[PDB]
Symmetry: D2
């Protein structure tokens, strides 16, 4: 059974960048629903599989990817943020960033653009290509998870579904992206990077 | 050149079902952006076509469908709503509804379910199948327009992108759908129906 | 464990409409690989589900839908054909066809159109819509199965992957469609239609 | 007006790797239809654009991407092959291949994998990423063109639609891939690589 992880900080810890109302709805309602629905779908999957019911397994895929993906993405998102966050990363990761994107600023532009470029609901990601052995930016639709659909290792994700910013920034998604950089938890991102550089 | 149509009523005319803040942002910001971006993309399309640049034409498709679709959908949505709205339709349309969906209530359930069922951004629609000569409910992702992608004639659309309801109903999309029935402009929907029954 | 079903007839039982070489390859090779690959994929899925590895379950979806769908579709296809096929259905089924498509001739043309219309690999289908309670035609891409991705109950399917006709008809898919009508097992399609008649 | 390009060689110039029957059908029939169908689609698009008919422009996208992509891909494919092909590239291109894929052998295996991996119709590609400034492998479905749907500049493409190999290799696509390496026109791929070398 999958569970909703506790937020690693207070709901208002990311203010004024992401307000408390958004954080609370985001965690207690949106993420909660993803794990609850995921557990329901996996149980139905368990039943379909035991029966060899291929039709049922296939009909269940949209719900499994959407809900399971929702859980995966938000669980990573919470850890990617921090009240003491902001600034730039250091060492090997910063090395890679400058190497793979020219500079930190060029990286910010590219990730921002990938995030602002999502038409509809989705996510912008900084990931790691284990095969090429380098960093890579990608965008995912709806709740499609980075690794399950692209094979890339998630390092930093930016949720651009409207529920992630609308109450505070309304239609101005670029202001939300500008503000989020101030709360990125580079320690966590670094951790994830070093974890796949092994 | 495409233009942003005036709303056929005051921004607060649909209260308390859809508040004025949402209507104003919805029309003046979201729809505006769709037509502005559409005009930009069509102009680029005009250039690509004159040159026989197939690659450019194809690269331009996502923006054309998204923005052009945004314009089509919202232009219909505004007319599908009315301050004096609500209740049930009459005559031939009501006939079709009962015939094709069992009853009005069964129709409401089905359209609502199609609308609540959209994972991510999208629209729920009551359309008309000219080939089969009957009504049909469908759901469209992001701004994909009903007719251009399904061939069905739009009669009644329900925008379920989060910007269409979040500020007022937050994560509770079912409350938004419950409320919207009170402002449906059945006169307009009837008009559209009789227009394709010719 | 899923198994490759024997054909209801000899490989050259459908000559000259679909030649022996095609039937043998299509069954002994194409279908064979789908069943074996499906079993392998399911096993991996059972393991991923057991560990609660969501990323793995998601990464396996393409293979499950592709191989499971290939198994579902082909199993249906073989029973939809018969050396003594051809002509038209009778009683109930014929009645429904006249009712929903105007006439048997029109229906053939409609299903032929959906089949010829597939860009790339796929399938053309005559299915039953339980909710609306009527026949419906649909086209599915690659091996996406009708019921699992659409909800319609499959009654008659036409495989338009090039491997289904290229050796004999080359690039002229319409010649293949014209020919297949001569071997359709209407007895089986009728059986399938009467089964979901609720 | 787009036109069907002549082949740079005789239909049986690539025997025994890709037989004459395949080359003739592939070029004189498949490519021929894409160019003619593309022109017809473009005309309809110019008309729809002129009227500002957005629904029509959108309904035409599938045909434009499919036929325009078919024209783009095949035009590239013919120049990527040569009776005197085979072996490996030299200088700059080879250098980049060793750099981004480890070795030429590894690169072949990577591109073979992408090509064999396509479920349904499609294409496997070696392209150039202008932003990252390196080679990249990608697979495209049906006739979706590489640059128009991905941004990568096409350098070498491998057609894995069944019509590209079924008459000769039947269901065994890997045998086709092994064979094609013997006719790759590295002179042309090198030319394409040096052209986007900015
Ligand atoms: Mn979210
Ligand atoms: Mn909207
Ligand atoms: Mn087949
Ligand atoms: Mn081809």
């Amino acid at each position: 059974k999958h569970s909703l992880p506790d937020l690693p900080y207070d709901y208002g810890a990311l203010e004024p960048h992401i307000n408390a109302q958004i954080m609370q709805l985001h965690h207690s309602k949106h993420h909660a629903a993803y794990v609850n629905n995921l557990n329901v779908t996996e149980e139905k999957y368990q039943e379909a599989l035991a029966k060899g019911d291929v039709t049922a397994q296939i009909a269940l895929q949209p719900a499994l990817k959407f809900n399971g993906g929702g859980h995966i993405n938000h669980s990573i998102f919470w850890t990617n943020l921090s009240p003491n966050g902001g600034g730039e990363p250091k060492g090997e990761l910063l090395e890679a960033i400058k190497r793979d994107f020219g500079s930190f600023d060029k990286f910010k532009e590219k990730l921002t653009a990938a995030s602002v470029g999502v038409q509809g609901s989705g996510w912008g990601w900084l990931g790691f290509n284990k095969e090429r052995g380098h960093l890579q930016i990608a965008a995912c639709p709806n709740q499609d998870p980075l690794q399950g659909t692209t094979g890339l290792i998630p390092l930093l994700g930016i949720d651009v579904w409207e529920h992630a910013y609308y109450l505070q920034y309304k239609n101005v998604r670029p202001d939300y992206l500008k503000a989020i950089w101030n709360v990125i938890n580079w320690e966590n991102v670094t951790e994830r990077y070093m974890a796949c550089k092994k």
